[PDB]
Write a structure and sequence with these properties.
part of a larger assembly; 4 chains; 726 residues; alpha/beta; Catalase HpII,  Chain A, domain 1; Hemocyanin, N-terminal domain; Rossmann fold; 3 domains; six-stranded parallel sheet; 16% strand; globular; binds protoporphyrin IX containing FE; metal-binding (chain A); EC 1.11.1.6 (chain A)
């Protein structure tokens, strides 16, 4: 036995906070967490304990340390079938990554509606509040490879596979309510422009390069989603703290055959929260797996990601009642005009067992709809329908990708399709065609109906000539970017200006920067002037006189477009760094930990080395990480208890820890002699809003800190951070 | 409902003779036939009855007859996801066929040893007579594509997958005891030479072309297997009536670590039997699926193919005691020197459900051995070990081919291998490496032992320099071809001569024919002179004076090498054509069918049209096929009962049916007025005749059937125009 | 669409890092040639003054829109232009290398200092005036093709020699030894260093339980672990690291004499490495630092040279 | 895509056009063509938008579909005229 006698190799199969135990495959960490889909995967789960090591043919291996050779210092022999099988499997482990959204993190969970939506849709999964639908969700970036970093500036994907009783429904959305382009024909052009440049394959996970901004400057339809990407929306704190959107207008079809237009939404029950750029970029270096880790650990801790499914509903007769085209995916539907109606809740409560088998091999596709839903003529959605089926044939090695365990429906599936690479199903039907008499025509077609009926498309009227033509109704590019801009808080506006300024500063060809500034002048002159100033560009008199675009149906703002204008902060699942010293005041620590625990806020005990430290009362304190090992970037706030402050007062890493957290607008709390640290962050003796200070870490101290954490960041500090060298 | 009210669409789920019912997937035809492997495939079997038609995502389809269009006469829309899924699946159905042995037919069965072989091997599947091992067997040709014909002249493959309690063991053999080449390095050269020529991809399923005979003429090591291919061995009657061989010398390893050399054999319990060349070639045209059909229908009828596994055993100390090298795969071990010891029986008793899923996707590989077995340095076997794993990566789309249901072991399999295309298994092990402490090092290595131990190679002594050199002991090419030749009956010798003569007549470049005749002169002068005569070639004085090769260990023949020298005929499962007339003598028919039933011989009632005919007593006789629809090529014997012979006496197809059967040496039985047919077939040997069909008449016919063919008829068949 | 001042086009002359936009090699340095670079001319495709086409050679009129039934209508299945374009896009990716997936490459040439005919009959080492084109790829080991350059890892240093008597590939690393002794253990070692199976963390890092578990249980790994933990694991540039073949190979001369050999690459720019904090922060600020530095050094005329 | 192993089947010699072919498509299994275009997208300024679209015309023009009238509902229905 190679395991330690104390059993410390095995994580506790119960919820534990981040860092308390080693992470583990979901069925081992949470064996009692189940759903219909998770149970259905049992047939393909492979254990390991108490089993002999074998070849793939079931032959027991005696020596897994050596190749077969002619003498102990001789040549390796071709007859070593064990070596060749092992090396062959290894040599062929890789599969192509997804063209886009290659970097992603996934979890299992469930969905249930609040009430029956039978009135507006015949979709079975929305028919009954007590009907639970298992889900598998993958969150992703867009540009970067599967080995790229999480906290890049990008759009995020939010894909949900619903295992319904009437088929798989895939909700393939993003974290912004619009896309960059209007027609699917341009998707390869846009994606090639944002992706690493062809000659040298630089830059990874970044849109800050010439080709991207060249395309944007030449295709003003991109400006709306570019605004969202340049905002703090482009750098979420967690997959748990971002919104989700289907983007396209789809249709709901009820039993009577009535069509209602719908746009899909996911509301994060943990609230909306994003990083700041310097922190996000640094985090790509310090922990490129930050989001993947945070998701896995939140689930292991019982801080289950929860989202509310919502619908914006528009009657068929209201198709033309807005200033924009409902079928235009570069346009959002302001919630002030069409509210989001609450539909149901999704909870992600179990991690996969094997990332490759379940996450990498998962195939989501927006064409996977069910009776009660339908498409629209949105020309971006239209092209997506072709792409997803197509790409899966090479990525997943054939037309039998639905047989890969994660992708299988939990409901019945029977048809006349046969063969294809890696065919798992063994069909016993004497017939492989229909109509047939030899099997009495089974499996049989099913007429459409209110429940358990066959799929029939909504009989939408089509009138026109065969044309490759953009609708003139889609030819408006500045009003939605402006509405977004005006809906942001002043600090959110600053962050957008900084986003554009940083990105355009990386564009080598100055004329591209000038062309982008010209586009900004068509959106808002304050925005354009601020970006121009940072680039050492002067707006022309013509540019200064560009008439602003129209308001959107009389709206000059919609606060639902801001991350922070309307407080929705929730501290459960957040994390605090506690900076230890070699003689911690145990009374401070007791108060700190008790208060954090009560609000579901985790703590990580940090020091200048690993191991343990002893508190003033003899309590042995285990160290989670070093100041360098777990930087402030990875936490939401920092607390420094009293004790022997002299131990850490001159520690460069401890001082920098506070300077970084300060620069990144995080709440900081200093108890007793820890207030000596106010000098490194230039806090006046009188104090400052966002710095919690007291003689000890009492109830009032912790309440103040937790109130600041509910507000996420100390925006009032922004004017003060420029002076700090961090 | 589209099914007929009488239920005649559905085959009876019970054993029925060939042609009596439509054929069906195995688990519908024989639902109660089971074994551990067949049961383990239940998790992936999909039914159909009473289910709704869906997409692969489980969405019910309302209209599976139409694409989605803008108007009933409009363009098809890109949003039709149902159409695109259906067409996409269809568009991607095909996978690469096998490089060689692409044409094959398979079935499920079981194996059981007669006694424990614990004394000579620790292989678990041979440890106890009560130990039943499920098998999956695939029979094949070599050259032809998956769409080529069955009854070509070729070597046949005979591959057995044993689902053992200690791992999959694949016995990947052929129907001849040797191979064409000595070293695996030449395999692509040989195969390229026999395969269709590169410029034009001709000919299919035929070695009768210039490149094959060019290679043979330049590589005399090929001559032994060429002799077998030119003989009637190259055209088996059925996969049930051919021998099987592992070819290579392998090793058996016992619990004490003793190695015994072994060569594997399969003895057909239905006996050895082959077609004649004209019949075989014409059958490739009339029924290119003849062997596949015969196998499937024998199983459906309960005429289960049975084979006895046998071992030729040679002690390690006897490695050098023969005139040939044991490691040379172009050399056979004469049974007169080393007998075949009976080991066990294999029964094939169930067809697959889906040919593609189970047969096409099956992967056999000779490197798939188990503890108790080992390899030798045979340089052909050595290279095979590399090839099979390799080819399966592209043919079956990745390294997870063992996860394709037919290929899955029935015993446990656990290791640290992960990922790869179409990964099915979801590993829960916290570790994907060893040694590990995080999972207490599981799954763990197992030391070798008497039972349930890990695999350890036999510690064979290796001494020598790193050389790409053929052993001088392999440099003898004519003695085994001569042994084979001398062991054949005179009619078998004639068929060999005719095989070479026909093949070389299709070689365009005359010098290649001359070079092959020169090789034959090194084997036997009678053989060489007979082939030369047929090619209009004269042997030179030098050729006439070539000293014949040496005997093989003093043997000038071994009857075990002949198909027919030692009768081993079995009539069960054979088929007789009964040629009907519009007023059959019912008394003749009763006697015929009763006698055939008693011996398990099947009958097919033939006429000039389909439907029914009425006998002299009013009995309604259903017609199975027409004279043209089911030619004599497809049957073993022909019976013509009495009645209104005038109805068929002038029927060209009926007359030709008998002339073809006559030419092809098949037994023919004529009752009463049917004897009028003797004149039209120019007449002799193996013609049963009497006033009526009875005990005597049928006994005579069945005696002829046990002998397979009427060899005595050969001397004057050349003259018959058929 | 190009600016009238021509600022879109880089100068086809050596320029320092950041002075001009980077460009494809054949456009940046058109007069830099070798036998291999010339032999690739048959497959180089230009673009200027050519019409935009399908892969079948059909000129495209409108590359901005799908074919639809009306300007607000559904997309038609008969749009073969859209489907070809999207199909090619959908199938762009190929599997990355199991190991050394992250790598940066350049063309160059090799020339010996003297004939080595006395110790080897290898043609490319037979004459100091025999120039052998090369293609070199430098890499990390663990990380994906989208991972960062300045990780702590071993670096690959692979050279393809296009010899007159065949391709010789000298596939080495930047340390003189490997972690393991027998190839049978390669999947175990690589699985241990790679992201852990359950959650696929961490990327480009050996700082995790399974790696150190394996190391602790397999002391043969300790020598290369020492090199990886040293500043050798964080090179400043691919130009400032050593290369090694690791294995003992043989040289065979015309007389058939065998000499044992171990291969080395000496950086003529010297040996230099980053410091850990700098390296880790650089993975964040510029994950393409080494790839960029290599490309820009070549564009500047600071050609990487190795002995 | 599966028969010929990828999207570059037009590069297999027998399939290659004899006329010019230039576009912004890149990569794919067994990619033969080495593209030198600084741009892999359009519209682009970095390569003055080359290769460029061509208007339809009498000779050497770009492909444009005939503007056939479309009238009807989205249906999975066989025309009665086919019956
Ligand atoms: C509303 C705009 C869009 C959204 C919200 C969207 C979203 C996504 C998401 C979330 C994924 C990741 C799902 C997964 O893990 O498999 C993805 C994958 C993909 N998308 Fe999109 N997408 C959009 C438009 C497009 C378009 C226009 C195309 C192509 C014409 C496209 C082609 C693909 C392909 C080829 C993949 C990889 C597919 C797979 O391998 O599973 N997407 N998309
Ligand atoms: C004694 C000599 C040989 C015999 C009896 C033999 C027999 C067979 C048989 C029966 C099969 C088809 C099995 C099936 O899939 O149903 C086959 C397949 C094949 N053989 Fe052999 N073979 C011989 C030598 C060789 C050699 C020397 C090579 C290469 C070194 C070779 C390479 C292959 C390959 C690549 C296939 C296809 C394997 C596959 O795709 O499943 N064979 N062989
Ligand atoms: C001294 C030890 C080793 C060295 C120096 C070495 C070096 C390298 C390098 C530099 C590359 C990347 C070449 C490129 O730029 O594409 C590479 C790739 C690879 N190595 Fe090794 N390697 C070592 C050991 C191993 C072992 C023991 C194996 C397998 C049993 C192995 C299997 C591979 C494979 C499969 C790849 C990917 C090959 C490919 O995908 O082109 N390597 N190795």
């Amino acid at each position: 036995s190679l395991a330690p006698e104390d059993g410390s190799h095995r994580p506790a199969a119960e919820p534990t906070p981040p860092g308390a135990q080693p992470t583990a495959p979901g069925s081992l960490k949470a064996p009692d967490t189940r759903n219909e889909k998770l149970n259905s995967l049992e047939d393909v789960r492979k254990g390991s304990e108490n089993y002999a090591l074998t070849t793939n043919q079931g032959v027991r291996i005696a020596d897994d340390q050596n190749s077969l050779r002619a003498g102990s210092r001789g040549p390796t022999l071709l007859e070593d079938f064990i070596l060749r099988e092992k090396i062959t499997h290894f040599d062929h482990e890789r599969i192509p990554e997804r063209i886009v959204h290659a970097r992603g993190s996934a979890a299992h969970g469930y969905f249930q509606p609040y009430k029956s939506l039978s009135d507006i849709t015949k979709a079975d999964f929305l028919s009954d509040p007590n009907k639970i639908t298992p889900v598998f969700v993958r969150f992703s970036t867009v540009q970067g490879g599967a080995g790229s970093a999480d906290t890049v500036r990008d759009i995020r994907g939010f894909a949900t596979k619903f295992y319904t009783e009437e088929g798989i429904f895939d909700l393939v959305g993003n974290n912004t309510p619009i896309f960059f382009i209007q027609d699917a024909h341009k998707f390869p052009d846009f994606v090639h422009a944002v992706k690493p440049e062809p000659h040298w394959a630089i830059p990874q996970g970044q849109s800050a390069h010439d080709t991207f901004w060249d395309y944007v400057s030449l295709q003003p339809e991109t400006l709306h989603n570019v605004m969202w990407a340049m905002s703090d929306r482009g750098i979420p704190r967690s997959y748990r703290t971002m919104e989700g959107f289907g983007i396209h207008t789809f249709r709901l079809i009820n039993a009577e055959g009535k069509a209602t237009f719908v746009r899909f939404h996911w509301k994060p029950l943990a609230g909306k929260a994003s990083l700041v750029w310097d922190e996000a970029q640094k985090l790509t270096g310090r922990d490129p797996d930050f989001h993947r880790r945070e998701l896995w650990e939140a689930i292991e801790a019982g801080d289950f990601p929860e989202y509310e499914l919502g619908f914006q509903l528009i009657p068929e007769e209201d198709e033309f009642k807005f200033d924009f085209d409902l079928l235009d995916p570069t346009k959002l539907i302001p919630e002030e005009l069409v509210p989001v109606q609450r539909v149901g809740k999704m909870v992600l409560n179990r991690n996969p067992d094997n990332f490759f088998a379940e996450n990498e091999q998962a195939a989501f596709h927006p064409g996977h709809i069910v009776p009660g839903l339908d498409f629209t003529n949105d020309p971006l959605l239209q092209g997506r329908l072709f792409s997803y089926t197509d790409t899966q044939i090479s990525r997943l090695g054939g037309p039998n990708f639905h047989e890969i365990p994660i992708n299988r429906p939990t409901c019945p599936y029977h048809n006349f399709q046969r063969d294809g690479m890696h065919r798992m199903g063994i069909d016993t039907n004497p017939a492989n065609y229909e109509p047939n008499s030899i099997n009495d025509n089974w499996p049989r077609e099913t007429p459409p109906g209110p429940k358990r009926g066959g799929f029939e498309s909504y009989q939408e009227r089509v009138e026109g000539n065969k044309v490759r033509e953009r609708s003139p109704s889609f030819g408006e590019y500045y009003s939605h970017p402006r509405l977004f801009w005006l809906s942001q808080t002043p600090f959110e506006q600053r962050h957008i200006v900084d986003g554009f300024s940083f990105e355009l500063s990386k564009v080598v060809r100055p004329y591209i920067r000038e062309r982008v500034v010209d586009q900004l002048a068509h959106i808002d002159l304050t925005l354009a002037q601020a970006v121009a100033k940072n680039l050492g560009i002067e707006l022309t008199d013509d540019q200064l006189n560009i008439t602003p675009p129209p308001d959107v149906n009389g709206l000059k703002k919609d606060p639902s477009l801001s991350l922070y204008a309307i407080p929705d902060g929730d501290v459960k699942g957040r994390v605090v760094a506690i900076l230890l010293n070699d003689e911690v005041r145990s009374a401070d620590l007791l108060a700190i930990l008790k208060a954090l625990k009560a609000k579901g806020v985790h703590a990580k005990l940090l020091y200048s080395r690993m191991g343990e430290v002893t508190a003033d009362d003899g309590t042995v304190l285990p160290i989670a990480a070093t100041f360098a090992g777990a930087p402030s970037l990875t936490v939401d706030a920092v607390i420094v208890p009293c004790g022997n402050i002299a131990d850490i007062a001159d520690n460069g890493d401890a001082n920098y820890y506070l300077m970084e957290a300060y620069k990144h607008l995080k709440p900081i709390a200093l108890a007793g002699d820890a207030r000596k640290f106010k000098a490194t962050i230039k806090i006046a003796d009188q104090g400052e809003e966002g710095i919690v200070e007291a003689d000890s870490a009492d109830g009032s101290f912790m309440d103040e800190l937790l109130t600041l954490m509910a507000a996420h960041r100390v925006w009032s500090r922004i004017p003060k951070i420029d002076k700090i060298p961090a």
